Amino acid sequence: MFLERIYWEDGLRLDSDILDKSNLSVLERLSTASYLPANLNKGIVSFDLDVLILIKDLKLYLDEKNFVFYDKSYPLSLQIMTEIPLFLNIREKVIEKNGVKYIYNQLSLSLEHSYGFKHSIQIALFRLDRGRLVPEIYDFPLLTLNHYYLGDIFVKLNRTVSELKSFNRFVFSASRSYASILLVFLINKLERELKFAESNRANSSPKQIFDLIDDIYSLIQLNLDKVEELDSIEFDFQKPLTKLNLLADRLLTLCEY
Amino acid sequence: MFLERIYWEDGLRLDSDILDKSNLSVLERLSTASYLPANLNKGIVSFDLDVLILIKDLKLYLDEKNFVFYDKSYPLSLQIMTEIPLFLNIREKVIEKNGVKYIYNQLSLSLEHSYGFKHSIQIALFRLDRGRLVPEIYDFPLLTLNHYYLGDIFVKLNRTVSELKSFNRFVFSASRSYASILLVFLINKLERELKFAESNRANSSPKQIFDLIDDIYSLIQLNLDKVEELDSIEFDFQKPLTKLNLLADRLLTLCEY
Amino acid sequence: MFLERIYWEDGLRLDSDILDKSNLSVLERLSTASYLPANLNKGIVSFDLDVLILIKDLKLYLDEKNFVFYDKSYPLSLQIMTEIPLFLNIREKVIEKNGVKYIYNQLSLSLEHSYGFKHSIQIALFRLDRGRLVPEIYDFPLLTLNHYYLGDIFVKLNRTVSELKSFNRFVFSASRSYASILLVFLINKLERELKFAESNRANSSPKQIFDLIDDIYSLIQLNLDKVEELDSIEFDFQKPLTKLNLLADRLLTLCEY
């Protein structure tokens, strides 16, 4: 049910309930009318942690375009002790500032899902071996590229670029000299995009990188002279990191020859 | 005139009129400040109908960034009887929910323009032959790709891809072997983009598809060895479906040879 | 500190201060939740001047996503008399419309920074020689392409396209016939993009043009047979015009041979 705005013209004794309802309706209406890139309903715009789990930057969109922002006023840590899911808890509370009451949102971390909270959504997956807490991939859309898992992806992509250069130099150029120029062209394009993306994390998206890698993969398959059936992977806005990892692994497997 | 926010500091007897005016001003200000992709003022984000005209999904932005959403609470049909324009009517009405009055927007369908309504904008064009109601192209910007007319476009594009493959295999490769590799590359790129777009309708735009088709067209014209004058068509954000149809028709005409 | 919404449930004598605070908090919350392309915090969406400095169109986002709009109700001129910085001043004032008080934002132009104003941000740089006021490049992000400085950039880009065609026709094609096809392809792509961008200014961004020019530059460097070290320039969302000018100048310098 889409309620538009509240109806004031009737006239009634101004109580707190009607004002709170009006504010809530206005907020809901304007949040619904808002737009996100690629018409997404939720995503992560920034999420970084210290490398005990300590949160430095947290900014994301929950389901139905709910905005969550983390103030640096209080620490956000869990400090586990001994497949470990990580959950985010949002509880509202009343605080007073310079003589005026307000409504605040308090963030917390828990090991499992909890009740009695406004929101409880899993945001990360962690696996520990001898107390190391190796990060793990979790399926969630992200809008920007400044995610804590992107370091491993960048290292793997640099290794893939080096492997691609070696593969083109050694055997691919000798067999098919015609497509070698286009392959070098696309490799340089990917390298330039990676160099730009590493320096600027908040102004990039995974779709461009996935498109470049997929294009490089398809170009090799077309002239590979192997079986005519080519395996195609489609990008998914729900699991982008998984698709990037699978594409990189397949590219490395084909490049190792 | 850009009114920013209302001025409360004067102090006055709190009547319903001032509260309604404040809410309206806040809504107008925040709607004006909003942003849409490619800096558009209106567009269609989702519009699907059953295949009597029955509406299943309706979501679009009117002029001056006005947001219209269709609740599935009530049916939305016209049921014509015997170039048939279709119009959308918006009338506001007062409803009460759990003891609180609200303002609701009611949607309706009419054969022609009507007065006495908040909005009356034509959204579709229909032509019937022996009571069939064949869909017709209407000029209106759309943000996503889930429009009811995209099925015919997808079928035509698949046929165009097959025709392009046949044309490249038969005559184009034999005459110009140099550009054949690039042509096959671009054809595969278009095929991959089409495969992704068909599965994911809400996360795609017509501009990418138009760019790919136009690029394929230009590549053929450059090495076609025919008259040096090449006909170039520019994408228009006001009539995207028309441009797509014209480009596809021209590509098919050139491919039939 | 992220204050969410105001707390009304306590109940208190309804004064103007609490209503103004509630409106301000709602506006701040919804402005913070808003999103801009490439996750930018500020930018210019439209800025045109008559060619005394007379402002015709002014629309931009200030820092922290503050929206500024210029009404055509009053003139906006400076009329200097004799490195001249230009500043924008925003002062709020109370106006009354049809019996209802409101809050208005008044825009002004000044030679230097001023105090006692809500905002004072430099937006343009001008240099005069014998009273001519030649426009100068200032570093500021812009979202669309309808900026007053784009005319010179478009002229330089057309000259660059002509120079690139001449360079490819004369010497580059004779030495390396393999990459000539790809170079002509990319030149035609850039020409088509420029033709589209000139007609449609409000629906384009500098990133696409920069990517096309950089791609053309890299393709030439790869097969240039000169020193293997290639100079790469990265696009910056903070100084896009500067990067475009530097890339165009370097391309012209390399093309002159």
UniProtKB/TrEMBL annotation, chains A, B, C:
Q: Which residues of the full protein are shown?
A: 4 to 271 of 401
Q: Superkingdom, according to UniProt?
A: Bacteria
Q: What is the protein's given name?
A: Intracellular growth locus
Protein source organism: Francisella tularensis
